[model samples]
Structure formats: structure tokens, C-alpha cells
Target chain A: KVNCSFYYKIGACRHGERCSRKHVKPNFSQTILCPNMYKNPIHEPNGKKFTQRELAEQFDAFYEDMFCEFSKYGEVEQLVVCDNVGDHLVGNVYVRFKYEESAQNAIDDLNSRWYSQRPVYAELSPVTDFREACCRQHETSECQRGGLCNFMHAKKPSPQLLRDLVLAQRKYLALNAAEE
Target chain B: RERSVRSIEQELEQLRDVTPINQWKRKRSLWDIKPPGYELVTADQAKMSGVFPLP
Candidate 1:
């Protein structure tokens, strides 16, 4: 696909009049050789630079404010705020509302209201693409992918969760990156 | 050896996340972790070639 024979595009010509009236079957072996495989340029930078830690920590208070003030209809599921500096006072939190509708309502109603003299911007999406990206990068794929893919997510006694993450990251760092 | 405990605590500050509760306690960069495995991306894709930072 990357480097194919630039022969011709044998697609059904629908621009103007039909050249032949008979229906011709596209040859399975007769492929289009145009050197163009990817339909679109791969989208990178979906998440910001300080995505996992920094942004989370930076926006922690913003989410907490939402969970405290905005959320009324139902419970919150995840709220995450991160800071780029891991060694600063910045902290991040992730929260998910109980019901999709509840999240929608809160986001729709009070998303950008001024809080702490700053405007709040919370995006709503069911897919935890960043978390999945982290997991994939960390090589935590043994748990399987499904509804409970993140079943190992530690909830209470946050310290344990943090410790687990540190250890997991340490091992991952040693195995994949350091290789020493 | 008296202040060694405090110094050790300072070294161990990385054991915790930097937050408002302990901002004054230390000055460590959390993102200063090593063993960089993930591919570092660029602002633009096509035009970018890269130089590896020494690990």
C-alpha cells in the first residue's frame, strides 16, 4: 500500500456517461496501484503534552468544582485534572458521572462558568482513549479488552493506587525503555 | 546524622505526587523520569525528522 504500482484506478466511472453497458466485475487480483494507502493523514497530538499527569493535576480543582457544584442530576464517574510538573503543587483528578445523561446535563449547563476566577472547560466522551493509550504504552494488555478492561483501576485508599502505578511504571520503564 | 532523616525524606519526596498539600515540602520534577520508550512526537508530522536525546 505504501509503495504500490501506479498503474491506474479501475473504479466504476460515474463522472459522466458510461463507456460500456455490460456490468464488469472488478478483478480481485487487479488492484489499484497508486501508492496511496492511507485515506487520511494520521492524526497525532490528540492529547496535550502534559496529558496524563500535568494537565490532570492542573485541572484537578476545576473537576472537583464540577463534581461539587455542577453535578446535581446524578453521581460522577470520573474527573481528572493534571499538572505538567510532577514535582509541584499541581494535582489532577478524573471523575465519571453515574449516568451519561447526568454528565451531559452538567457539561451542557455549567461547563464554562467562571470558577476560581477561571473558566471551566470539560469535554464529554465515553471512550477513555488517553487511559487506553497509557495502558497500551505501559504493556498492561494481559487484562483483556472489554467492558471491564479497566477493572484493575484502584478506587479507594488512593495511596495504594498511586504506589501500584509507580511500581508498574518502574517495571515498564526498566523492561521497555531502559533495557538495562 | 540528625538532619539526615530530613534529607532522606527530601530525596524520597518523589514517592508522592506534588500537590498543594505539599508544594513547599520539595522541588522535584515529576516528569523527570527516565527510561524513555515512547516515541516523542513533533508539532508537524511530515517535515519532522528527529535526533535522539541521550538516554
Candidate 2:
């Protein structure tokens, strides 16, 4: 019966908490919001900058690592790392699951955690069509945003890697089937 | 322009030895004071909140 807090951000709420039309705060569990989570080491004090290839490789590595880490909580159906440069979207990580219970479980586990000496602010996002929400430029191998777009820009996995993901996902589903 | 074809299997295998951050070992800093979990929303309910599903 609850809804998203029109007041999710300070001074942004213009309605009552019990408004029939409300923005009830999401579980904040099934999904995690990690800002600047994909900060690439493109620039160094030594004036060294990483090439696009390096950034893609590093991002892929982080994606895999995060996927592995989050798996401990439950079966994740979708995990997306946003590469958008927008203040709100940059380096954001969105994780969704086949089961809502698992999403809540993850929030329960990480709400009290910190990242890189800063408190990790994990929140719920209303993003449903993840793949569709992505910018076309990124997937097409060129982004007009050029680091300033509000959409994620990253590399696509090779066909082989997709197959591997399928294999892994099958294993997960098999285990879930066995459990029930 | 030349595109490089890389092997996913080889690259993935190479990362086996890399150790990632152990989240549990990090210091705990409770910031938010709310309970975890999303509200149970139906299609009509979501519409009430200004979120409409795709066609």
C-alpha cells in the first residue's frame, strides 16, 4: 500500500505520505544503487590515461567481481553497471532478482556496509526495462554522449561469454529447481 | 581500422587469480535508518505512482 517517497531527495517531495498517488519507497533490497561505482582509472597523477580498451576491460572485470559477490545473497536475474556520466547515473549498479525475498535479503546485509572509506548508499531504482533503457550509441560501439550522456556506455560480451553466462544461469536454475 | 578478436574464455581464465574486495572485511557504517524491502505494487498501483509499464 506504500509508494515511492516523493520526498526521496530533500525538498523534492510535493505530496503527502499517504497520498493515493504516491511513490512508495522501494524495498531497496532487490536492487542496489552504487554511484561512481565504475570509476575507471583513466587518468593518473603521472598524466597517464587509459585507453578505451583498458576501460572496457576494467569495467568487465568489475562487473564479474560484483556479480560473484552479489551471488552470495541470492539468485540475481539482472545486474547492470551504468557507465553514464550523469551525476545521478554514473557508475550506478542495478541488481534485480527472480525472487523479491532475495532482494530484501541483500539490502539487509549491505545497508550497514561501507565502500572505499565511504558509506555505501544502496537504494531502489524504478528501472524495469534495463536493456531498453540503455542508450543506442553505447551498444552500437560509438556514443554521442562522449562521457556526458545519462545512459550507460560499456562493452558487450562476446558470443562465447554469453554462452558461458547461459551455462552458469542454467546451473543456478537447476539448483533452484532442486531446492523447491 | 582494425578490430581485435579476443577470446572470452582465455580472458576470463586469466582473471582467476585476481582477488576482489572482501566486502565483509570492510568497516560498517550504517547510514540509512529504514527497513529493507520494496512495496508490493500491482500494475494499476504502479500507475498510481506515475510509473507505467512498457507496451
Candidate 3:
């Protein structure tokens, strides 16, 4: 399963540096999420999903600058750059806050104006609710990928799972639309 | 005497002489910040259309 770079287990080493995990961790000096990480919010026409390289790595040419600069406001938890489309790059993001209510505060304070000297316009979107959704999605995807090695692990097509998939898709639509 | 926050114009006039840098921080002094959506593609449609909503 994909993980945030900052998800540390409180080790004496690698303190206050780039982490490979995004979940909340001990010794949090400030509020943060996946601020500068590369994000892919859509499906590729070739069926390739966005990888970390696409978001943070290839960001200079597009929307990466805004997120990086905005990290100054507070600690970023998870910055999800999404495209919502079955194919394409991430067009929106779900930024999580380190504090209990900082996520809501950032949402209100966020100007939503977008656009700066940077190539990409700033997206003042609220993705705090997406936290659980993200977890669920990763779990499902991981299980599916796991099926490659252990065919037995392949999930049986269940009506409940199908229903959930539909709901998740709908929720994705609303969550994405709210940004517009 | 504090003035109404909405009457920034009046405050600007009143503080014009009394204050120096404070006026610099006045709302009027701040420039409009535009969204940076033009870098990816030219037209707003290009950028918007290129976006494929996530799920």
C-alpha cells in the first residue's frame, strides 16, 4: 500500500526530515501533510496511474510550485493532486492538517483564488474528509495487486463490494466537484 | 480611535499622514493575486478540459 513519507515510528535517527510516510507521527514539530509530494489524481489513457514521480518530480513544469510554496502556512499532512478522470493527471488535491481542526481552518482561510507566479493555479479544495476514503481505496487496490501472486487472495465479486465501489465513485465526484 | 474595518478607505485617509508603513499594508496597497492555471496550457478550457475528475 502507498504510504506517506512522514509516517515515522519515533526513531532516534531521521528526525525532522523528508519521510516516506504521510500518516501522523510522533515528534511532530508542526502541522503537516503530504505538502510537496508528487500527486496523480487521474487515470492515464495508457492505464498507468500517477506515481510520486509525476506529482513532485515533474511539478516544476505545472502545478507543483504552488503546493510547495503554500507549505509555509502550516504543516501539510497529505496533498493529493487528483485529476478525477479515468485518464489524466491529478487536477485536485486533498490536504490533511496535523492539528485536530486545522484542516477546517485551512479550508476557510484558503483563498481558492489559485494561480501565482507558479505554473499551476492554487486549488483551495477541502480534502479533509478524503482521509478515510483514501485508506479504503489503497486497501482495495493493494488487495487486488496482491492477487497477482496469490490467486486465492483475489477478492470474490460481492454485491456489497460492488455497491461500495459505486458509492465511492459518487463520493469522488462530489468531492472533486466541490473544488470547482 | 479605531475605525470600522470595512471603511478602509476612510482609514486610509485618516492614517495617511499619521502612519507611514501601516498605509503600505492597507488593503488598497495589496495587489490582486491571480490563479496560476496558465502554465500547463493556454486557454482556461485547455486546462479545465484536461482535468479528469478523480475518484
Candidate 4:
């Protein structure tokens, strides 16, 4: 038995109670669904469409900036960004923490939290199969809908991006502590 | 400026009968529409490739 694609992709399936496949809700032990926050909007970028590579770079850049900034609240276990072009799901970021308390604390502090010089909205999302939710276009460069497909297509940011950001953060914190 | 208790109950009852649960519920904000923080990923770059986290 395979996971239901539709449900994993968007949290609901048309089959509902009759769905023969298993409908597993995402484990939210220390997870949050943070969406609709990003560096820019689609229509205003001077009409230049970004390919997935650029999107990956964008994700890495975003991760570097966000990791240090958000870590003040708790340990971030995982962070994934959605590359969907859909009006609703694009630019969605999922954050996982090591402890539920950390998740809660982050949420309390983050809901309507401001970042990147703008206010960002945060909420609980029970989605954990982001890998499965990625559209085939990311793999094959071919999807029937092309630009209109509704599945996620984001590439993970490079590991180096995350590593350097963490190191930088550690150094900055050390400097602060020495000053204090 | 409070309405009479009877009038309030009557309005509540009418609302309960007339509105479907779905109709009255506000759409989940982040899931239903684009919030104000997003910037567009206009097309221009190489292919998107990466190893997805299995968990």
C-alpha cells in the first residue's frame, strides 16, 4: 500500500472516508507549518522567471538568514521550503524543533512575527512528507501542467549554506557573550 | 448598547439554521491565500535538483 499522493500534497483528498489508501496525518510532535513568507512576490520581479537552481540558491540564502535569526527561540531540527507556483502553497516553510515546548514557544513568539522587514504569519501544519509532495517536474523537467502544476518543486538548500550560517551564528553569539 | 436577550437568541438560532459550517468558517489564512510576506520566484535559472529528506 502506497501513501496517498493527493492527501500528502495538500492535506486533503477527494476520496475522504472512502479512500482505500491510508490517510496518515503528519506528526506534529515538534513541527509547524509556516507559509506565505518569502523574499519577494511573483509579479514584481521585473518579469524574469526563476529556474529551480536559482530557487535552490534562494532557499539556501533564506536558510542562512533565517537559521541564525530564528535559533534564538529554540533548536531547529529541520526546515523545508515549498517551491510550488500555486497561489496558496508556494514559499511555505516547515520548521521542526527537538521539543514540543520549543515548538510551542516558537509558535507563540512567531505567529504574526515580523521578519525580513515584514510581518509573517505562522500556524500548525501536519505535513511531513514534503519529499513526496514535490512535483515530478522537479525530477523529470516534464509535467503536463508545466507552470501551473500545484505540487511543491523546491530543491533543498546546499548543506554548506546551512553549515556556514551556523558557524557564523556561533561566532556572533560568542562575541556577544564576551562583550557582556 | 446590548440587545435584548430574546433578540440575541433569535439571531443566533437563525444563523445556526441558515449557515453551513463551511460557509461561516474563515478560510485557513496561510493555506487559502497568499499572505503579505511572499516574494515571487520569477523564472530564470538552472534546473532544481537536490536530495529530499526522507523523514
Which model scores highest in lDDT?
4
Highest TM-score among the candidates is held by which one? Answer: 2
Off by over 4 Å in 2: A1-24, A28-30, A43-54, A116-118, A146-148, A154-159, A176-180, B1-55
Model 2 quality (TM-score): 0.56
TM-score of chain A of each: 0.33, 0.68, 0.32, 0.63
What ranking of all candidate models by DockQ puts the best one first?
A: 3, 2, 1, 4
Give candidate 4's chain B TM-score.
0.28
| lDDT (10s digit) by residue, model 3, range B1-55 | 2343435445444433332211112211111234455444442343366552222
- DockQ measured for candidate 2: 0.03
DockQ for the candidates, in order = 0.02, 0.03, 0.04, 0.01
Q: Compute fnat per model.
A: 0.00, 0.00, 0.06, 0.00
Instruction: Name the better of 2 and 4 by lDDT.
Output: 4
- For model 1, the superposed segments whose C-alpha errors exceed 4 Å read A1-66, A85-94, A129-180, B1-55
Give the alpha carbon lDDT tens digit for every residue of A1-180 in model 4: 788766565543446557898777543546665665653434456525877666565556666555544565566666667655554565666676667777677666775344543355565555556566667677577556633666665546687666655454444433333342
Better of 2 and 4 by TM-score: 2
Candidate 1 positional error at A161, Å? 13
A1-180 per-residue lDDT for model 3 (tens digits)? 444432231111122234443544333232223222233333336435657555333343333233333333444444444322221121333444456445434443443323322123322322234433332433466433321221111112234433333333333333333352
- Candidate 1 structure quality by residue, lDDT tens digits, B1-55: 6575555455445434423211222222221122233234321221132332100
- Where in model 4 is the C-alpha error above 4 Å? A1-28, A39-42, A45-59, A140-150, A166-180, B1-55
Q: How would you encode candidate 2's per-residue C-alpha lDDT over A2-112 as one tens digit per residue?
A: 543322321012233444655545554355555455554553363246676766655555565556556667776777776555454556677777666777777666655
Best-fitting candidate, measured by DockQ?
A: 3
Candidates 1 and 3 compared: the better one by lDDT is 3
